[PDB]
Amino acid sequence: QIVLSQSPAILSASPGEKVTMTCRASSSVSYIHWFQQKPGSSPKPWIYATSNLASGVPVRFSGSGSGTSYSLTISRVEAEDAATYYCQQWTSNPPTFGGGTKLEIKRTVAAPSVFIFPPSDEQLKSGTASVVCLLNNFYPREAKVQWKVDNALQSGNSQESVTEQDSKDSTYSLSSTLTLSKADYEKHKVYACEVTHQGLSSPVTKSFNRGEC
Amino acid sequence: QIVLSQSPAILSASPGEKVTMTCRASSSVSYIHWFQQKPGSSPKPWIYATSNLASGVPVRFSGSGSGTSYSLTISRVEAEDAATYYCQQWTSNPPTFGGGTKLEIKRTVAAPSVFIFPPSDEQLKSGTASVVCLLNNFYPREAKVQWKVDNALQSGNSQESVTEQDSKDSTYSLSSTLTLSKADYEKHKVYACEVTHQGLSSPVTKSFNRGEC
Amino acid sequence: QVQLQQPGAELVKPGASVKMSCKASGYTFTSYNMHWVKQTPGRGLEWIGAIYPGNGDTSYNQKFKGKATLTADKSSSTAYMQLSSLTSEDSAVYYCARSTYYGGDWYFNVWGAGTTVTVSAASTKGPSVFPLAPSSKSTSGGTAALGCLVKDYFPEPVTVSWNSGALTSGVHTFPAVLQSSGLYSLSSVVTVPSSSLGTQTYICNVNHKPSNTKVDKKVEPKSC
Amino acid sequence: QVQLQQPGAELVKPGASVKMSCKASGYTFTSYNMHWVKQTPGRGLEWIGAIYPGNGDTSYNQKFKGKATLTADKSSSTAYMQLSSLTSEDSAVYYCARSTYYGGDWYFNVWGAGTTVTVSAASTKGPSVFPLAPSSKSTSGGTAALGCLVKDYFPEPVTVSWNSGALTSGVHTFPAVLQSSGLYSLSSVVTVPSSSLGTQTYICNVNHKPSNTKVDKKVEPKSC
Amino acid sequence: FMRESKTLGAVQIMNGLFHIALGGLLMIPAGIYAPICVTVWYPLWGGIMYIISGSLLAATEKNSRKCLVKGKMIMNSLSLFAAISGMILSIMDILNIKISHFLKMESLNFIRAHTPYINIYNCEPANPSEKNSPSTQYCYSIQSLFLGILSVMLIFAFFQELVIAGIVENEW
Amino acid sequence: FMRESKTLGAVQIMNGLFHIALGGLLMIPAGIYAPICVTVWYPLWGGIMYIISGSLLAATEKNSRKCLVKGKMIMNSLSLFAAISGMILSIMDILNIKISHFLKMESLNFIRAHTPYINIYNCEPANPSEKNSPSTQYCYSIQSLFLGILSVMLIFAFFQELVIAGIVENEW
Ligand SMILES: CC(C)CCC[C@@H](C)[C@H]1CC[C@H]2[C@@H]3CC=C4C[C@@H](OC(=O)CCC(=O)O)CC[C@]4(C)[C@H]3CC[C@]12C
Ligand SMILES: CC(C)CCC[C@@H](C)[C@H]1CC[C@H]2[C@@H]3CC=C4C[C@@H](OC(=O)CCC(=O)O)CC[C@]4(C)[C@H]3CC[C@]12C
Ligand SMILES: CC(C)CCC[C@@H](C)[C@H]1CC[C@H]2[C@@H]3CC=C4C[C@@H](OC(=O)CCC(=O)O)CC[C@]4(C)[C@H]3CC[C@]12C
Ligand SMILES: CC(C)CCC[C@@H](C)[C@H]1CC[C@H]2[C@@H]3CC=C4C[C@@H](OC(=O)CCC(=O)O)CC[C@]4(C)[C@H]3CC[C@]12C
Ligand SMILES: CC(C)CCC[C@@H](C)[C@H]1CC[C@H]2[C@@H]3CC=C4C[C@@H](OC(=O)CCC(=O)O)CC[C@]4(C)[C@H]3CC[C@]12C
Ligand SMILES: CC(C)CCC[C@@H](C)[C@H]1CC[C@H]2[C@@H]3CC=C4C[C@@H](OC(=O)CCC(=O)O)CC[C@]4(C)[C@H]3CC[C@]12C
Ligand SMILES: CCCCCCCCCCCCCCC
Ligand SMILES: CCCCCCCCCCCCCCC
Ligand SMILES: CCCCCCCCCCCCCCC
Ligand SMILES: CCCCCCCCCCCCCCC
Ligand SMILES: CCCCCCCCCCCCCCC
Ligand SMILES: CCCCCCCCCCCCCCC
Ligand SMILES: CCCCCCCCCCCCCCC
Ligand SMILES: CCCCCCCCCCCCCCC
Ligand SMILES: CCCCCCCCCCCCCCC
Ligand SMILES: CCCCCCCCCCCCCCC
């Protein structure tokens, strides 16, 4: 068994700028293979034989390197390449895949916009309650959220999921959805969702009311 | 170097009858390959991996065999398969091709028809002379010819070429063309071309004249 | 034209046995190999073994030599992978990709869709989708966000569309997160102009294959 | 769609040098190999060597290690084979066929047209074609034979058609035979009904590529 | 056995040279994972010291004061130590190459450069279609011949260990 | 050298032990074309007769009447013949494996069955794309290992020839 390690694990490259990633191995493999995968899709083959290119590839990509060190060179990286690249070898049984370099687009920062969706009547009639706060067009990944109900700050009662990087419109989207029981749902009336970020200067907050709309 | 020999060199099989040819080798080759070629054409691949079939092959063919002996089996041979089969291996450098089994269609015999073409005026005006005798629809290959001029039999003054086996109309065609100088061309007037064969009972002869037609 | 067909997903109870399927078309099933790989986000993608339909020979690795077995038949041009002794730590995606000697060495010419297996004792739960009506806040804006939150559903594979796939741009698919009790919850929102909110209809049609549950609900903007 | 293009034929004087060409299209020229073979009726078909365009490596055999050399370039996607020290016993057909690892071992997927080289000191001679007028013999028959004898021509490659390829069935292509002086002579006849002899025209168009000589003569039946 | 201590030294030095020859024979570049008996360079110093011990036992054979008598016992004890060590490495490496690999030690840098794309410890093709191919037969032959070398080295080491143990039995 | 011809007896014994060891090691299944020293079966009887000669020379070292004195000369002459033959065939097979083969002697039937799809004398792939592949590196390792076997066998046979030539020059 031959272990393959590639660094860095995650790198951010500005559009229209040369970027290079390296894939080293614990042994001198005869040839190396590079594959990329998209969310909800199979890893499409990208580079074979360490020097050639698979069908349907942009001309910008050009793989090279010899010996125990192999590198991937991009002439001009764009937002279309927002995926993870895998390093694969075929010298020794069994073949072992690499870790993965998650490409990131490094453009100018953007001020996030906050949107709050009050729960519908059918949600209450079902037996639960759920209010959704929307986060979009923000960079970097970190985005602190502090829900306030009845002038009280609550933390640790919600879960957040990070989606894939958007191509052109936005960069990242954080799902800051707050869940609670019906007793606490009827205990409070006014709900607020304030998100602070390095982009916007003054933190904007959207607040609604319960029993009116 | 591994030598490959296959027998028989030439075999005749009746249409709609099972026929099998063998290809032995001086060494136990890992796999065997069978190719067929047509006149004025490249040898198209026929059988690979000793068990599979290439694209565009009839289902009748089925190759088998293991070890130092490999055989080709035909469920129903037809006139469409009138070609030569080659035996090829890939175990040892360099690969060596086989000899070749020339398939022949063994149907009922046919009586040959004789046609004689007198030379044209432009042939004489060029400075030479050539009379062509046509042989067709005869079997087997052997077809004796004995040109007679001025009630004299001449032999050894002509050359014959054997063409490929016809598919449906005929079986073999022999080019019995007689060549001679202008002096002997004008020396004699009547020319005859009689061909004897096992097919026809009474040898038919076609004779013409010089200076009239 | 070469492609490999695989089932979407299925649920397997722990300690049971499941059989995979990978149908091949457009090429000689006997000649090419039938390599299988397994991808896990925690530990990356790793090899599991391969099978040759030509002779029935199989190859594995010492890590998972006895965990899985491979069996393929040339009559149906399909390869079957059977898993034994399922474990809660065996919830990943299994891919079916052929291998060819291209460019001087073995190379994965084509891959497969893959199966997202789920190992959990929880029973099947229907996809509960709820509307997210936008509110008439002070900030009017030129665009509005319409979402259809889906929570308390099983299993993970679920597809959320809009107007039967009419709207594609501006969508934000949020990956689901496992809950404490063993349930999934995700969200999906689309950005549309606020001027067309009162004219163009917006409906989300959630599709559930394991339970054959399809719901086409309508979300309408709310004026507060 | 994969195919390899080769020149028809050319004449080489003994002791000279000739370069072969094999253009490849429809597939990656760099990835696949460029195997070459030589076929001779006297001693069968034998290997001559191969070249890999990817790295430029070449392989030969001890029989003809120094007789021929191989050189290929990836810019034009063409492979060049150069022959040295031509000999009168080197008049055969050279084929260009790629090799792929298909079915478990190396296999010639596609072949090439091939070049019929001729090694002779004789000068180029135009194709002399003569008519063969049928005679009104006693046996009328329902069919008649029309031929266009070609003799005293160089080199061997020559194509004889009828009505620009309109008539294909009933043709009998007779292979040429070498003469004592070093010249070729062949024949070609077609069987047509005698009833249409006086109505439908029959012309043979001999084509000669090395000399760019094309003759379209007309043959007419003779009533004796 | 005290009758022919001169010939016993010749046998010991012959065994040492056979060990040296086998060790140099095992240095042929084959796989980045060299045998456990080579990466420690056991045949080199072991064989040289067998040469020294056998020569000492078959050089003087007289009542030398300090050069021969005093050093003979320590040389024999070191010989027993090296022989049992060689037996242990041989028994370990036979199972290392024939059953499974449990101590993975890389080969030398200067010898692994010639053949860096090859491995012999675990050669089972990932593509099952290559099972009946020369690529696996070559590795099978490599493994078989390496196992034969290991077996012959083991039997020579065991015989030498027996001989030197008998020598120590003679000289309390 | 008439002083300790007994030690030379043990030399011949050890040389026979290693000769039969190398003969057994040569018949590892690798290619249908066995080495020229294998198909002739030289190492087996060579080592057996070396052991016989060493036993004859290192058994009694007394003045036996007919069983030893009469046979010693003929055994020594046969030993010289066998040793010069071994040297000749070894240095011939070295060129056979390193240069183009000029005798193609087939291997034994029972040993060629295991590996009938492989060859070792020549390996230059018809596909040049496999030049930097394990398929050729394995054959190169096989060739180097076999050449090492040939070299060690050749040098040991030459040393045995020198020793037995000394024995014969001692006994006119
Ligand atoms: C252990 C003690 C007693 C002896 C030391 C062993 C060395 C004398 C041997 C062991 C392996 C041999 C090496 C095996 C392989 C090669 C490759 C060889 O490469 C070539 O020159 C080949 C050229 C060609 O292929 O034509 C250079 C010599 C070398 C390093 C040999 C040098 C001598 C080495 C190191
Ligand atoms: C007793 C000494 C002094 C002389 C005899 C030594 C060798 C001629 C003998 C001893 C043990 C024999 C070995 C005993 C067992 C085997 C197993 C045999 O099977 C395998 O290891 C794998 C075979 C395969 O891969 O097919 C290979 C030959 C071998 C090493 C034999 C090779 C020849 C050996 C080393
Ligand atoms: C690797 C193992 C399994 C086999 C090794 C075989 C030989 C290399 C060994 C086995 C016993 C050894 C023998 C043990 C005893 C003697 C007696 C010795 O002569 C005597 O001691 C005779 C006493 C006298 O002359 O009175 C000559 C060397 C010899 C044959 C030794 C030579 C080397 C032998 C044959
Ligand atoms: C030359 C004199 C002194 C010793 C005779 C040598 C034999 C003892 C050795 C030489 C090669 C060995 C053979 C090498 C390879 C094999 C393959 C082996 O096949 C198997 O059983 C392998 C089974 C598996 O792979 O699990 C059977 C034993 C055999 C014939 C060995 C039997 C013993 C042989 C003939
Ligand atoms: C003097 C004796 C009693 C002890 C030493 C014997 C071996 C340790 C030495 C003697 C000659 C050496 C050989 C000298 C030359 C070479 C050439 C060398 O290069 C090759 O043959 C090919 C290397 C390659 O393929 O890269 C391989 C090692 C080898 C056989 C050496 C292997 C180790 C050998 C056999
Ligand atoms: C393969 C070739 C190139 C190298 C072989 C090296 C050794 C196996 C040979 C070389 C010289 C041989 C030595 C030649 C002389 C002797 C002397 C002999 O003792 C004596 O004759 C000393 C005389 C006395 O005691 O007075 C002990 C064996 C020995 C070392 C021989 C042991 C084996 C030796 C070292
Ligand atoms: C007392 C003789 C020397 C014993 C120790 C031998 C050491 C050899 C060098 C180290 C071997 C391992 C090298 C790993 C880098
Ligand atoms: C007789 C003692 C030998 C000791 C070991 C010497 C061999 C060289 C050891 C170093 C090899 C170079 C590798 C260094 C990384
Ligand atoms: C002969 C010197 C003692 C050797 C004891 C065995 C050494 C085995 C190799 C070293 C093991 C190292 C394990 C990896 C750290
Ligand atoms: C005298 C040596 C006996 C064997 C020493 C231990 C060897 C390792 C144990 C056997 C293998 C177990 C680990 C397999 C992964
Ligand atoms: C000082 C005398 C003993 C020297 C022992 C040297 C052992 C290693 C010899 C080979 C070294 C590597 C050579 C590579 C060219
Ligand atoms: C006097 C000892 C025997 C010498 C002759 C050995 C013959 C061995 C058998 C023949 C070897 C070649 C076999 C070819 C089939
Ligand atoms: C010590 C004398 C040995 C003579 C050779 C015996 C080996 C067997 C020879 C026949 C092998 C079987 C093959 C017959 C075709
Ligand atoms: C040791 C007995 C004499 C051997 C002489 C050399 C024999 C070489 C092999 C036989 C050659 C046969 C040539 C093919 C017929
Ligand atoms: C003592 C042996 C010297 C060499 C004996 C002749 C070997 C054959 C001649 C060298 C090879 C020539 C033929 C090459 C095809
Ligand atoms: C009569 C005692 C000497 C016998 C020598 C036999 C030599 C050949 C031994 C191996 C024969 C092949 C065994 C295959 C199973």
The CATH architecture that domain C3-119 belongs to is Sandwich (2.60)
Chains that touch E (3 or more CB pairs under 8 A): A, B, C, D, F
List C-alpha distances in Å: C50 to C26, C36, C38, E120, F160: 20, 6, 12, 21, 54
Please name the residue that has the structure tokens 């970190």. Answer: A142
Q: Which CATH number is A113-209's, of 3.40.50.720, 2.40.30.10, 3.50.30.20, 2.60.40.10?
A: 2.60.40.10
Contact assessment for residue D35 and residue D106, using Cβ atoms and an 8 Å cutoff = no
Q: Which CATH number is C128-218's, of 2.60.40.10, 3.40.50.1100, 3.40.50.300, 3.40.50.720?
A: 2.60.40.10
Cβ-based neighbour number of residue A145 at 10 Å: 18
CA separation for the pair A153, A146 (Å, rounded): 6
In DSSP terms, F65 is beta-bridged to none
Nearest CA to ligand 2 atom 30: E148
Coil vs helix vs strand at C207: strand
Q: Which CATH superfamily is domain A4-105 in?
A: Immunoglobulins (2.60.40.10)
Look at residues C19, C45, C9 and name the one whose alpha carbon lies nearest to residue C120: C9
A114 CB-side CA count, 13 A:
25
The DSSP symbol for F33 reads B
The DSSP symbol for E112 reads H
Phi-psi region of B150 (alpha: psi -120 to 50; beta: other; left: phi over 0): left
For the record, the structure tokens of D14 come out as 């003994």
Longest dimension (CA), chain C: 71
Cβ-based neighbour number of residue A113 at 10 Å: 20
Coil vs helix vs strand at B168: coil
In DSSP terms, A129 is beta-bridged to A180
Which one-letter amino acid corresponds to residue B159?
Q
Cβ-based neighbour number of residue C140 at 10 Å: 8
Helix, strand, coil percent values for chain D (each to nearest 5): 0, 45, 55
Cβ-based neighbour number of residue F61 at 10 Å: 12
CA separation for the pair C112, A33 (Å, rounded): 18
For the record, the structure tokens of E122 come out as 């675990």
CA separation for the pair C2, B212 (Å, rounded): 71
The CA-to-CA distance between both ends of chain F, in Å, stands at: 12
Look at residues D150, D169, D167 and name the one whose alpha carbon lies nearest to residue D207: D150
Contact assessment for residue D54 and residue D31, using Cβ atoms and an 8 Å cutoff = yes
Cβ-based neighbour number of residue B196 at 10 Å: 14
Residues of D numbered 85-104 whose beta carbons fall under 8 angstroms of chain C's beta carbons: which are they?
100-104
Helices E42-57 and E134-170, interaxial angle, to 10°? 30
Q: Where are the domains of chain D?
A: 3-119, 128-218
Nearest CA to ligand 1 atom 1: E24
For the record, the structure tokens of D107 come out as 């296999």
Contact assessment for residue A27 and residue A37, using Cβ atoms and an 8 Å cutoff = no
Residues of C with CB below 8 A from F130's CB? 104
Which one-letter amino acid corresponds to residue E125?
P
Please name the residue that has the structure tokens 């002869």. Answer: B205
Contact assessment for residue C104 and residue A31, using Cβ atoms and an 8 Å cutoff = yes
Helix, strand, coil percent values for chain A (each to nearest 5): 5, 45, 50
Q: How far is the CA of D127 from the centre of ligand 7 (A)?
A: 84
Coil vs helix vs strand at A92: coil
Nearest CA to ligand 15 atom 3: F92
Q: How far is CA C23 from the centre of its chain?
A: 17
Query: Interior CA angle at B88 toward B82 and B91, to 5°?
Result: 165
Residues of D numbered 22-51 whose beta carbons fall under 8 angstroms of chain C's beta carbons: which are they?
28, 30-31
CA separation for the pair F42, A175 (Å, rounded): 82
CA separation for the pair D81, D95 (Å, rounded): 11
D72 touching chain F per CB within 8 A = no
CA separation for the pair D206, D159 (Å, rounded): 6
In DSSP terms, C12 is beta-bridged to C119
CA separation for the pair D94, D118 (Å, rounded): 11
B95 touching chain F per CB within 8 A = yes
Distance from the Cα of A30 to chain E's closest Cα (Å) equals: 5
Look at residues D83, D93, D97, D99 and name the one whose alpha carbon lies nearest to residue D115: D93
Q: Where are the domains of chain A?
A: 4-105, 113-209
Q: How far is the CA of F31 from the centre of ligand 15 (A)?
A: 22
State the DSSP string of D24-87: EESS-TTTS---EEEEETTTEEEEEEEE-TTT--EE--SSSTTTEEEEEETTTTEEEEEE-S--
CA separation for the pair E7, E18 (Å, rounded): 16
Helix boundaries (H) for chain A:
121-126, 182-187
Contact assessment for residue C98 and residue C32, using Cβ atoms and an 8 Å cutoff = yes
The DSSP symbol for C166 reads T
Which one-letter amino acid corresponds to residue B24?
R
For the record, the structure tokens of C55 come out as 């002779």
Q: Which residues contact D80 (CB under 8 A, 6 or more apart)?
A: D19, D20, D21, D70, D71, D72, D73
Experimental method: cryo-EM
Which one-letter amino acid corresponds to residue A180?
L
Phi-psi region of B63 (alpha: psi -120 to 50; beta: other; left: phi over 0): beta
CA separation for the pair A196, A48 (Å, rounded): 45
Q: How far is CA E68 from the centre of its chain?
A: 27
Longest dimension (CA), chain D: 71
Phi-psi region of A26 (alpha: psi -120 to 50; beta: other; left: phi over 0): alpha
| C3-119 and C128-218 agree in CATH topology | yes
Coil vs helix vs strand at D126: coil
